[PDB]
Amino acid sequence: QHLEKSAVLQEARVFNETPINPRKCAHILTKILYLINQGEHLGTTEATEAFFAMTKLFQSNDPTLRRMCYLTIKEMSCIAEDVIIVTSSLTKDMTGKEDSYRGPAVRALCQITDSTMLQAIERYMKQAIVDKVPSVSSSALVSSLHLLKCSFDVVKRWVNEAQEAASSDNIMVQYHALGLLYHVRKNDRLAVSKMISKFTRHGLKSPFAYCMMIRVASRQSCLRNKHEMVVYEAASAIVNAVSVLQLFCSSPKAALRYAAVRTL
Amino acid sequence: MRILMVGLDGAGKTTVLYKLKLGEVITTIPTIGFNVETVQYKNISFTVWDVGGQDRIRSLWRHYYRNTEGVIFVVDSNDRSRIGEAREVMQRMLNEDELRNAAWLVFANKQDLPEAMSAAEITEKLGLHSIRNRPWFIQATCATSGEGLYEGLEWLSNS
Amino acid sequence: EPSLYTVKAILILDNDGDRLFAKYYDDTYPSVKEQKAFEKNIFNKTHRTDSEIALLEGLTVVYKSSIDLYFYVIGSSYENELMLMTVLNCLFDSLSQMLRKNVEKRALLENMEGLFLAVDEIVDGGVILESDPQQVVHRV
Ligand SMILES: Nc1nc2c(ncn2[C@@H]2O[C@H](COP(=O)(O)OP(=O)(O)NP(=O)(O)O)[C@@H](O)[C@H]2O)c(=O)[nH]1
Numbered sequence: 001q002h003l004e005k006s007a008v009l010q011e012a013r014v015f016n017e018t019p020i021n022p023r024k025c026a027h028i029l030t031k032i033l034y035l036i037n038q039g040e041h042l043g044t045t046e047a048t049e050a051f052f053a054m055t056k057l058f059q060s061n062d063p064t065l066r067r068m069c070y071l072t073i074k075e076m077s078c079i080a081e082d083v084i085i086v087t088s089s090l091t092k093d094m095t096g097k098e099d100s101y102r103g104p105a106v107r108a109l110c111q112i113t114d115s116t117m118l119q120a121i122e123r124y125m126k127q128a129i130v131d132k133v134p135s136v137s138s139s140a141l142v143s144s145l146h147l148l149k150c151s152f153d154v155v156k157r158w159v160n161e162a163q164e165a166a167s168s169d170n171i172m173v174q175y176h177a178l179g180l181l182y183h184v185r186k187n188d189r190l191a192v193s194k195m196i197s198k199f200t201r202h203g204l205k206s207p208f209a210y211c212m213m214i215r216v217a218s219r220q221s222c223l224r225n226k227h228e229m230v231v232y233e234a235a236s237a238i239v240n241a242v243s244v245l246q247l248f249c250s251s252p253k254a255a256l257r258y259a260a261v262r263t264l
Numbered sequence: 265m266r267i268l269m270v271g272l273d274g275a276g277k278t279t280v281l282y283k284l285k286l287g288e289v290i291t292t293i294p295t296i297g298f299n300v301e302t303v304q305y306k307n308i309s310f311t312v313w314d315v316g317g318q319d320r321i322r323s324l325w326r327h328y329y330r331n332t333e334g335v336i337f338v339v340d341s342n343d344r345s346r347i348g349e350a351r352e353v354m355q356r357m358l359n360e361d362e363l364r365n366a367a368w369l370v371f372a373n374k375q376d377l378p379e380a381m382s383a384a385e386i387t388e389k390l391g392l393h394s395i396r397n398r399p400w401f402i403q404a405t406c407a408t409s410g411e412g413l414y415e416g417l418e419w420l421s422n423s
Numbered sequence: 424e425p426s427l428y429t430v431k432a433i434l435i436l437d438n439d440g441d442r443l444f445a446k447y448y449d450d451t452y453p454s455v456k457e458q459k460a461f462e463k464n465i466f467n468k469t470h471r472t473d474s475e476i477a478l479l480e481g482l483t484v485v486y487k488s489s490i491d492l493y494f495y496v497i498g499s500s501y502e503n504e505l506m507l508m509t510v511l512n513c514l515f516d517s518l519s520q521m522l523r524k525n526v527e528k529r530a531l532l533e534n535m536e537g538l539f540l541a542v543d544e545i546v547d548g549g550v551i552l553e554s555d556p557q558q559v560v561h562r563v
């Protein structure tokens with residue numbers, strides 16, 4: 001419940017022992033995550049020691065422990081030194097047989113990967129982007145989005161796998177896919193216009209994609225959408241021969257009326 | 265039994281491990297990290313930590329030292345330029361307090377290649393004769409055939 | 424300017440507006456001090472209320488409650504309220520189905536693993552990952 005940092009970093013030293021208790025060790029990982037979520041500052045040295053203890057848990061095949069490991073990796077990625085040590089384990093897990101682990105692994109991998117090491121994993125990234133499992137595909141797309149900061153020139157190269165993914169029936173995948181595409185193509189005006197023209201016909205099946213695409217269209221139309229969110233988005237877009245009826249018609253409702261009124 | 269397997273990059277450490285685990289010769293990528301696997305040989309379950317040998321990773325082996333009962337040090341017998349470097353890495357590894365009593369098994373590997381140095385040659389170059397403080401053994405291996413691998417597991421289990 | 428980055432933060436606060444769970448997905452509240460300050464601020468405004476939406480500190484705050492707990496999704500005033508709302512609903516429904524129970528401080532602390540993993544299934548770095556509660560519950 002309510003505990004001290006030093007104690008927990010201590011019991012973390014049980015991870016170095018061979019006959020691993022998955023339940024117990026996962027509990028301790030949870031204590032660490034909590035300490036961190038609470039805002040407790042861990043030093044470079046103690047963080048690094050705990051990180052390297054956690055790696056040793058990769059010997060255990062317990063699923064919950066594995067998942068907790070992914071989390072721990074993402075959370076300590078910025079406070080511990082030499083997190084690169086997990087790269088192999090994650091590329092393994094991400095390419096592995098079991099889908100429950102695949103998306104999460106991509107996310108964690110990309111968190112500990114820096115623009116220097118990006119080249120080593122590019123092939124697997126392109127593979128995960130086009131995977132049929134939406135968990136994996138979505139994870140890889142958002143991952144790439146994040147990676148657009150540190151290294152843009154490597155990720156722009158991935159527009160093809162991205163485009164392939166943007167046809168997905170899965171609404172999240174489509175969302176992330178078109179999102180990523182824009183994030184790359186933003187600032188090359190031509191490719192954006194083409195981008196828009198493409199989905200103006202044979203539009204999308206994602207409400208979120210719809211919303212963001214409307215927002216895209218707004219840079220210097222149709223409110224018949226069957227999702228509340230898109231209709232609103234469209235509306236607020238339009239007002240910056242008008243038809244401001246649908247807003248007013250939204251004005252009568254639970255908690256949607258804030259959005260309506262807030263406009264103007 | 266807890267085993268740490270290291271050596272310079274491209275020595276054949278992962279090839280060895282997955283030959284042992286899968287009876288298969290896999291197509292490796294450089295290991296940026298570790299692989300950890302459990303292997304059964306004659307009633308012993310060896311937990312083998314294969315830790316990548318390229319420089320960045322080499323700097324990290326010390327975290328895997330603690331609790332190690334035995335050390336497999338893989339050498340590419342065909343690479344004469346890097347043998348001194350191997351010698352240097354291994355010598356200071358021998359000075360590590362967490363590795364103090366661990367059994368020391370050298371694999372002179374890629375013995376299958378025509379100009380591979382012999383195990384005796386390697387023994388002279390690595391300075392193995394000068395270890396008096398713990399058990400050592402050198403074994404010629406070919407990880408692709410599997411030659412010498414189980415002779416290694418055998419020696420190790422007799423720590 | 425359009426973005427996949429929508430969610431600014433996700434909070435779960437107890438009756439004292441103390442922090443059960445928090446993620447801040449950008450640099451608005453750089454240090455824990457000013458974060459906790461923000462959290463007190465928004466708790467003091469939203470405690471014992473049903474209004475499920477608020478403008479505070481120039482940000483849209485979307486929220487809802489259970490017995491001892493408050494759930495918040497925070498984003499820019501320039502975002503779409505209904506999208507934030509899909510995040511909040513996802514988080515609360517997901518947590519329900521997960522716990523198979525009324526969602527309260529006792530129950531939630533009983534499984535923190537689940538909470539962590541679930542929030543992680545919901546938002547990735549400010550991006551909405553999965554809006555569907557069932558998908559999220561499945562992934563744990
Ligand atoms: N001819 C021959 N090639 C071998 C032998 N063992 C491994 N190799 C090959 O030499 C290379 C070494 O691969 P690998 O085992 O991955 O080396 P490593 O020690 O794991 N290196 P790293 O630390 O960078 O992962 C591969 O091309 C592998 O197939 C062997 O006994 N004979």
Ligand SMILES: [Mg+2]
Nearest residue numbers: 277278295316
């Ligand atoms: Mg290797």
